[PDB]
Amino acid sequence: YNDGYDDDNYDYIVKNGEKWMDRYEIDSLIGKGSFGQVVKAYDRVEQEWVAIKIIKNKKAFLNQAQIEVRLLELMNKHDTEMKYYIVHLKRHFMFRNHLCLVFEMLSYNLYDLLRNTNFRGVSLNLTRKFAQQMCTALLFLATPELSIIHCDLKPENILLCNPKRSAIKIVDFGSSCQLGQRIYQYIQSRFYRSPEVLLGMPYDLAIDMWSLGCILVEMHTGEPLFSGANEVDQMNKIVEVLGIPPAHILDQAPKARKFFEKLPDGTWNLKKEYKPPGTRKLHNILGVETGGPGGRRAGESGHTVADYLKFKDLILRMLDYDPKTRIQPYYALQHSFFKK
Numbered sequence: 001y002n003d004g005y006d007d008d009n010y011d012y013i014v015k016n017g018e019k020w021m022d023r024y025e026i027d028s029l030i031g032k033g034s035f036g037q038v039v040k041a042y043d044r045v046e047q048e049w050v051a052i053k054i055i056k057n058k059k060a061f062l063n064q065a066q067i068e069v070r071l072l073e074l075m076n077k078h079d080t081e082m083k084y085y086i087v088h089l090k091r092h093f094m095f096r097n098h099l100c101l102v103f104e105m106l107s108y109n110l111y112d113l114l115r116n117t118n119f120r121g122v123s124l125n126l127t128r129k130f131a132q133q134m135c136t137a138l139l140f141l142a143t144p145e146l147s148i149i150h151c152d153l154k155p156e157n158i159l160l161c162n163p164k165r166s167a168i169k170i171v172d173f174g175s176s177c178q179l180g181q182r183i184y185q186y187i188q189s190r191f192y193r194s195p196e197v198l199l200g201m202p203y204d205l206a207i208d209m210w211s212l213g214c215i216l217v218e219m220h221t222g223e224p225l226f227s228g229a230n231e232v233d234q235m236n237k238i239v240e241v242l243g244i245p246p247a248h249i250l251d252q253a254p255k256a257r258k259f260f261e262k263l264p265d266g267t268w269n270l271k272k273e274y275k276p277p278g279t280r281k282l283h284n285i286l287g288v289e290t291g292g293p294g295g296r297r298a299g300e301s302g303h304t305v306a307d308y309l310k311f312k313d314l315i316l317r318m319l320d321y322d323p324k325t326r327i328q329p330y331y332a333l334q335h336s337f338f339k340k
């Protein structure tokens with residue numbers, strides 16, 4: 001494979017210490033994915049640490065990373081401070097038959113941050129900082145010129161700028177697309193997958209807002225809100241919390257009958273284990289009246305019952321079954337949860 005530079009996964013065989021075009025010193029492998037690999041590297045010329053995404057030597061992944069480059073460069077054009085919520089692509093190059101995207105060095109992802117809490121979660125105040133940033137990021141992506149659906153929002157794709165501050169950025173637009181297809185694809189990571197995508201329905205930018213609602217509850221509680229072992233398990237766990245989706249959704253939904261039954265009266269219920277629909281209140285998951293998740297926030301700053309009530313309101317508005325009425329980023333940012 002490739003004058004010996006590639007393994008049988010078409011990945012570049014990374015050597016710690018290697019120097020590239022007399023410029024970059026590869027320090028280590030920090031990241032792996034379907035796309036290929038990510039390495040930490042020192043740019044001798046600019047005197048800075050960088051993350052290089054090394055794409056696989058296969059034409060599908062090369063073509064997809066070309067779409068990623070296009071989108072990142074489109075975003076970088078914009079003369080707004082909102083584009084600083086998206087990881088900066090400095091430049092790209094072909095090297096030993098691999099496309100390489102050079103990024104700014106960021107820090108840990110939000111999954112690492114949860115592992116650092118031993119999966120008991122971060123304060124409501126830190127959740128709020130992350131939420132403001134993520135809603136701004138989504139307000140940016142929903143700019144008409146852009147209309148980018150990220151399509152894979154989850155803790156693992158949201159990184160800290162540095163381990164000392166609360167600043168974050170979204171990475172990995174490899175699964176992204178611009179709005180103007182309205183077709184079904186098996187997309188989003190299962191825990192963060194919108195009901196429209198579960199139901200085989202066409203999707204728009206609202207799916208990133210679904211994923212964000214799920215992420216913010218998990219940041220605070222320490223655990224995924226909806227941890228499905230499969231699509232049926234996933235929908236069933238959503239229905240435990242949010243109850244039966246509206247009939248006007250299910251009537252139009254190609255995969256409605258994978259999870260639901262239409263009854264003779266034209267109402268729907270779960271098909272043929274689980275708590276009855278809507279019995280797992282977000283009110284209780286958040287511990288609104290009981291000192292927050294598992295009572296662990298009992299008498300703490302900015303953990304009042306009213307604070308939890310505003311958070312709950314915002315989350316339930318992000319977890320709307322109906323993509324038409326699901327809160328849009330502008331309005332999310334005007335929510336009283338952010339009046340601190």
Ligand SMILES: COc1ccc(-c2cc(N)nc(N)n2)cc1
Pocket residue numbers: 031033038051053087103104105106107108159171172173
């Ligand atoms: C810590 O620095 C990093 C680590 C990873 C990335 C990154 C960017 C990107 N577009 N796609 C993926 N998969 N990863 C950027 C900076």
